[PDB]
């Protein structure tokens, strides 16, 4: 009765949302960008090969200086690299080696990691003694930590396999906000450029746009067929791309509340682990399970290039803030820089 | 170029520490402990978040990771264990109602593309409970596996002294139910080592050592290109 009534009300509301999305779907992004020129053949080359990780690399995050980067690999080490000279700036031994995410603070003073320990570990890079120590452990997630991103030195949004995200105060160690509504494992999160919103892609084939301060899910985006392992905002903050296990990337718009573009090819049958836009957002770079990365024209859905430089699963991918380079970290224990 | 040389020296010291820690890690054998709640997986070797059990056999150190603190959905976190030496799959062989669930889990592990290179040490635990279930005759495997009615004990079967033949047929039927999945795909890259075990058994660490030894022999043969 009541259950059935709520379920048919939910189906009515999904039909209303789908009809509104169909009403706003006057044209497609393929039609609007049909007349602009192609970007050509984007041929990035390996410039630096970051060697020193001795197990498979699971995550990476560029710093906002676009030179230092943090990499998380399951040898129990966070390495912070000077990408310009391939110099390792820090080697942080982790209490739990099963790390699945890392984040570099915008100030550059802190890094984060986490994984199967269900704890977001914040490390201070600017200690008085000069050694990197555990500044905070953020316990409270009841599932594995899959993504984390700093907003500043005091707040961090984490996503977890307990189907939730959480905005944490680092100083108090407490979840100031809990973001619930996903029904699968939340695999990735992406902060908006103003850091007022964030999208999170989960294992329910759905992405959710959340308000960081108001705390609720503002929008839910469907269209993917399988687990969304990867998410990244478009640089204007009005759109975002998702990478999933259904061998497709999808560009969704916030203000249109629907999928704008699918980036797929028939010879691609493997899932996407990482997505990142270029600085203008014209190139959508995606790391795949066929050991390669594809640069897609984000406006025309054409594969602009192939970063075929990894002997194992590309697990993470990141573009610098100034747009100079892309670092792809993979399961072959190497990170490679490309431009 | 004075702070640059200092950064290069710091990076080389970091490289030295990473190389030492990686050699130590390369000496540690990583294992993934998987099993249901009734399987008795915690009592196998008898030695929050992810739990780690460290034991040593013949100077070889094993880190067996029991992944607690996660939800029932495992298709993502299990990809963390691509590079483990073996997956120790513990099965309550007496719980006939969940043997199909254990077989489906074993099949999903055996055919996962990030787990198809990892050998599985199969512990068919609770063999005493399986024996007392078979000798009682109240619960029949044919009510859960009709092909057990057409199953015969293999000639290669090695029964325990004083073991009832119906108990032997039951335990080797459960073993062959897992080995049909194991031999159905992935021949050469990874092998399934079945072991019948109780909860009082103290030789499971030795069995893990022998199986891991076989696994490392085969991986070194593939590294040599002899196999």
């Amino acid at each position, epitope marked *: 009765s009541e259950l059935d009534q709520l379920r048919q009300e939910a189906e009515q509301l999904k039909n209303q949302i789908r009809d509104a999305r169909k009403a706003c779907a006057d044209a497609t992004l393929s039609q609007i960008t049909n007349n602009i020129d192609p970007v050509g053949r984007i041929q990035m080359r390996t410039r630096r090969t970051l060697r020193g990780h001795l197990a498979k690399i699971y995550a990476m995050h560029w710093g906002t200086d676009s030179r230092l980067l943090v990499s998380a690999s399951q040898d129990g080490k966070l390495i912070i690299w000077d990408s310009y000279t391939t110099n390792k700036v820090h080697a942080i031994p982790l209490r739990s080696s099963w790390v699945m995410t890392c984040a570099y603070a915008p100030s550059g003073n802190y890094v984060a990691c986490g994984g199967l320990d269900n704890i977001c570990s914040i490390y201070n890079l600017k200690t008085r003694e000069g050694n990197v120590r555990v500044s905070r452990e953020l316990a409270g997630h009841t599932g594995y930590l899959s993504c984390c991103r700093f907003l500043d030195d005091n707040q961090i949004v984490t996503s977890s396999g307990d*189907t939730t995200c959480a905005l944490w105060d680092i100083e108090t160690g407490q979840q100031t906000t809990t973001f619930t509504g996903h029904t699968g494992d939340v695999m990735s999160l992406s902060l908006a450029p103003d850091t007022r919103l964030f999208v999170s892609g989960a*294992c329910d084939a759905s992405a959710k746009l959340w308000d960081v301060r108001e705390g609720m899910c503002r929008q839910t985006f469907t*269209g993917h067929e399988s687990d969304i392992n990867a998410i990244c905002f478009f640089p204007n903050g009005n759109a975002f791309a998702t990478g999933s*296990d259904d061998a497709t990337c999808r560009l969704f718009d916030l203000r249109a509340d629907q999928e704008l573009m699918t980036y797929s090819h028939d010879n691609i049958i493997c899932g996407i682990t990482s997505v990142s836009f270029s600085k203008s957002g014209r190139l959508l770079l995606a790391g795949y399970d066929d050991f390669n990365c594809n640069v897609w024209d984000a406006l025309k859905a054409d594969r602009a290039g192939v970063l075929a430089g990894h002997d194992n699963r590309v697990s993470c991918l990141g573009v610098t803030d100034d747009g100079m380079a892309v670092a792809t970290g993979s399961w072959d224990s190497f990170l490679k820089i490309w431009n | 170029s004075a702070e640059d040389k200092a950064a290069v020296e710091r990076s080389k010291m970091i490289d030295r520490n990473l190389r030492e820690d990686g050699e130590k890690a390369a000496r540690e054998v990583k294992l993934l402990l998987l099993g249901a709640d009734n399987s008795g997986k915690s009592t196998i070797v008898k030695q929050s978040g992810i739990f780690e059990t460290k034991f040593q056999v013949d100077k070889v150190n094993f880190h067996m990771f029991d992944v607690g603190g996660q*939800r029932d959905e495992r298709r993502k976190w299990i990809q963390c264990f691509n590079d483990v030496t073996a997956i120790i799959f513990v099965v309550d062989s007496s719980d006939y109602n969940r043997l199909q669930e254990a077989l489906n889990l074993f*099949k999903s592990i055996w055919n996962n593309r990030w787990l198809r290179t990892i050998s599985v040490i199969l512990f068919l635990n609770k063999q005493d409970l399986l024996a007392e279930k078979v000798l009682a005759g109240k619960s029949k495997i044919e009510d859960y596996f009709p092909e057990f009615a057409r199953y015969t004990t293999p000639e290669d079967a090695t029964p325990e002294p004083g073991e009832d033949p119906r108990v032997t047929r039951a335990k080797y039927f459960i073993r062959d139910e897992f080995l049909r999945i194991s031999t159905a795909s992935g021949d050469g890259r990874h092998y399934c080592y079945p072991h019948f075990t109780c909860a009082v058994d103290t030789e499971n660490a030795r069995r893990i050592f022998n199986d891991v030894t076989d696994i490392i022999i085969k991986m070194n043969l593939r590294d040599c290109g002899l196999f």
Partner: nanobody
Framework: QVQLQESGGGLVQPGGSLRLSCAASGFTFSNYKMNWVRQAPGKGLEWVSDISQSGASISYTGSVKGRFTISRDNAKNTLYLQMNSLKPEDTAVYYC?????????????????????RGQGTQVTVSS
């Protein structure tokens, strides 16, 4: 939106027959191995049957072998479970569960409590 809608369940006599259908939408049906799972009253989620992407590799749980027939129509994107010779222990909420990743032989988490690529299920009651 990945949607699985099950129908055809209802009250049936012991020894009777039922045909479950599931309409699938939001994904390429032919790219996924498909599952039928059970939720008995008071028990956990139990896997029942699976049919491969093409429809060639079929397996059942042993309690339904010879009684249940899984099939798929990839053109109509529909999953069928023909439930002949029904027993009172088959009384359950039956769910159609899609395997989570396409083009895979492994099928993970389809019997999990909050699995996402699973329908709302239809109630099959086998009683006199």
């Amino acid at each position: 939106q990945v949607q699985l809608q099950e129908s055809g369940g209802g009250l049936v006599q012991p020894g009777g027959s039922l045909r479950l259908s599931c309409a699938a939408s939001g994904f390429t049906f032919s790219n996924y191995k498909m599952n039928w799972v059970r939720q008995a009253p008071g028990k956990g989620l139990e896997w029942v049957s699976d049919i491969s992407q093409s429809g060639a590799s079929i397996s059942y749980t042993g309690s339904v072998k010879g009684r249940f027939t899984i099939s798929r129509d990839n053109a109509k994107n529909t999953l069928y479970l023909q439930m002949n010779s029904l027993k009172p222990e088959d009384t359950a909420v039956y769910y159609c569960a899609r395997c989570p990743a396409p083009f895979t032989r492994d099928c993970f988490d389809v019997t999990s409590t909050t699995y996402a690529y699973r329908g709302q299920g239809t109630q099959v009651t086998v009683s006199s």
